[PDB]
Design a binder for this molecule. Sequence first.
Ligand SMILES: Nc1nc2c(ncn2[C@@H]2O[C@H]3COP(=O)(O)O[C@@H]4[C@@H](O)[C@H](n5cnc6c(N)ncnc65)O[C@H]4COP(=O)(O)O[C@@H]3[C@H]2O)c(=O)[nH]1
Lengths: 187, 177
Amino acid sequence: NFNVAHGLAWSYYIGYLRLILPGLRARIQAYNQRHKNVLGGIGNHRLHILFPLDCGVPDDLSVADPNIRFLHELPQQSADRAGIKGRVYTNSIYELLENGQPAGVCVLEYATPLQTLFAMSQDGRAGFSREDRLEQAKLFCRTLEDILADAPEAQNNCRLIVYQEPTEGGSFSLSQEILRHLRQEER
Amino acid sequence: NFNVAHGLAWSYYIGYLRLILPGLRARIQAYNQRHKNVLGGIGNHRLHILFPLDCGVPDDLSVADPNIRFLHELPQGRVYTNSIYELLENGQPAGVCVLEYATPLQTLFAMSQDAGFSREDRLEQAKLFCRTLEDILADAPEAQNNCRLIVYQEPTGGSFSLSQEILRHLRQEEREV
Ligand SMILES: Nc1nc2c(ncn2[C@@H]2O[C@H]3COP(=O)(O)O[C@@H]4[C@@H](O)[C@H](n5cnc6c(N)ncnc65)O[C@H]4COP(=O)(O)O[C@@H]3[C@H]2O)c(=O)[nH]1
């Protein structure tokens, strides 16, 4: 039984989003304070989560797209978690380039449960192919969104950036996709 | 839909157990080399995962039992650290091991506190989570030999001694070595 998406959504919400999002805005503030009249401030205070519905996450997106560039990590959030003293949650600020110059800066990351789905389709078991990985990833996204619609505070502290990928041409820039979202929160 | 246990089991094995267990021996013996002549070695090389079925998972193990005292961190993108604890019995140290809870049970717990999820629903997801993960471990001798579930049903305050439950499993593991 590989019907796993509902689990992934509730696990992501309770085990990460609802634990890390109430502290995010203060760790962005803290970082702005440490480098205020040097680095320049992060204005957008929401966590940007990439959701590639093919479940293709690279281990270093900075080296993936040359228009996405690691800036700094936020101040760490260390916490005792279920017997693990000092479990560490870290988050990263990235810069986005457009047509040469910089154009965006935000706290950004991939939705980690999509890696789970990815490993599941590669593990050699019988009834879980990319087809199923695809429908699981969309059910995951759907359920997580349903969950956030009933959590206004968490919904106001992050932004979900969902996209498929054309596996052919330059039909898609991920920086372009992120920049459009940042210019929608514009509003 | 609250059939969550299946996603919890696959999540916990694929995104954690599968990724930390292979290099657990090496972190232990690096610790043993660092701390041999002073703090002392860690004999038992396996991760011990507490699995309370009532989903009572405090973040500090000493709060669940004063006889479980933190000894030292097991050190070492995304970072994975663990905690070595020592078990007191009759006021004296009786066992040492890398020990932690199965964090996803906290997901089950918070779901019951809400929506559409009751305490019995929770207990049955906890039991389904347990069976599926144990099904997965039986299929992965690699991972199966380097961890141990410690499954129990008491609210971890009482005349139930969680430290005794752990010391029991620790001795049984020494027996089949
Ligand atoms: N980006 C990011 N995501 C995280 C982090 N911690 C958790 N998550 C996400 O939320 C997890 C569910 O939280 P939980 O701690 O209850 O999970 C359980 C947790 O008990 C265990 N685990 C994973 N990493 C660690 C860890 N570093 N330390 C201790 N336990 C860990 O295995 C986790 C499932 O891993 P996963 O597939 O990455 O699952 C999502 C994972 O997508 C994190 O630090 N960074």
